[model samples]
Target: MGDRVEALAIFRKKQGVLSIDSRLKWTGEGKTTPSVDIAFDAISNLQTTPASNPKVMIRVFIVVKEGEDPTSLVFHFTGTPNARENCDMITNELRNAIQRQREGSQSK
Candidate 1:
């Protein structure tokens, strides 16, 4: 996992980054971590939404757990193209990680 690469992208004034271990956080320019540090266990599943007119405007669906109401997050990023790629990569990693986390805890 240490060989993992970080996906850093910028959308106007916002900066988004996907950590190697699967911590996805974003913030505005000159800011630190995002307002909410969405842990890997809290997010899963990633899919791209159909684009209507906007081309560069990519939208990806994110499953937000941790008692989140929306259940899913539709992220619209004008950031680098890597943003879309990381969405799928990070989402899959989280889901697999969560399964392992639960499976490990379940085994006595």
Candidate 2:
């Protein structure tokens, strides 16, 4: 349902591929390819960082709703020119998808 980008999850620490559609999914680039899948409606916030002056990896921050509190996850984009572009594209798509889901769930 969406495009995929090479990414790293800094929380548990794994390099992988990520994508967003009705949900956000990250699958590790390992033999097992462990993955995380979270529904779009379950996310409370979405934010991103540019590659900035010193050129650290671009970052996407996802705030998720779970039980009594919220959890935050970070996905990193590094290493290639394509990585930076993909980060921008994916970040925009994710925000749009989140809005789509939110609007789909609520109506006056």
Candidate 3:
């Protein structure tokens, strides 16, 4: 439950999207653990254009393991119409997140 909440918070911060459904499954020989699956959607408003394509879909997979922070997050983006634009957004967002995380830890 805590893990899901954390993942949802991270996802919303990164994409400004709302999570529609999310699932977590545990797997391993001892059933230790494995990964999480997340899905979300965002609706954007365009004043000059018609409302036909106002919604964007996003899906993400988060893998977890022992001896690691369960909140460790990794994801992939889908349904982006322009690859170059999406890539730039992803790159900048990731860089900012990493930098902030590092700074926070250093201060602690």
Candidate 4:
């Protein structure tokens, strides 16, 4: 199950997995040789563009921190009645997950 299918990626918050190739089906119960993969922990920030634009496009910026270089992923939502809210909801949930993960890892 994927929450969002934008471009070629499937975003799954509960799974903490971002499958860059929709055809791979690598982050679920099964596994495949994924073309590219992005773990939730690797994401640092998310920004929405065309914040209210619908006719043109709506883009999400996934800021990723890797090595010394920062990269970003731009994906668009197909749109529904609650597109904006849903995006914000998912993003917030992701931030919450990040915080929980941070506190969860160093409790030894």
Model 2: per-residue Cα lDDT at residue 98: 69
Cα lDDT of model 4 by residue, 1-108, tens digit: 243432222233112122222121223223444423444455555565444666222223333536534455443333234545544544555445544555755463
| lDDT (Cα, tens digit) per residue for candidate 3, span 1-108 | 222221111233343222122232212222233333321111111011111333322232222333433243322223234323443343334334434444644554
Q: In model 3, which residue pairs have backbone atoms overlapping below 3 Å?
A: none
lDDT winner among the candidates? 2
Report the C-alpha lDDT of model 1 over 11-81, residue by residue, as the tens digit.
Answer: 34455554435444544455675533455455444444233323322232345555664344334444656
Q: Clash pairs of candidate 1? A: none
The per-prediction tally of clashing pairs is 0, 0, 0, 0
Model 3: how far residue 27 lies from native, Å:
18
The lowest-lDDT stretch of 10 consecutive residues in candidate 2 is 53-62
Model 4 lowest lDDT segment of ten = 16-25
Q: Among all windows of ten consecutive residues in candidate 3, which has the lowest summed lDDT?
A: 40-49
Most TM-score-accurate candidate = 2
lDDT of 2 by residue, 1-108 (tens): 653433444324665766665777766766354365666777767666654622324343445456534556666554334556666677777777867788978782
Indicate the residue-level lDDT of 70 in model 1. Answer: 36
The C-alpha local distance difference test score for the whole of candidate 3 amounts to: 0.28
Which whole-number lDDT from 0 to 100 does residue 83 have in model 2?
58
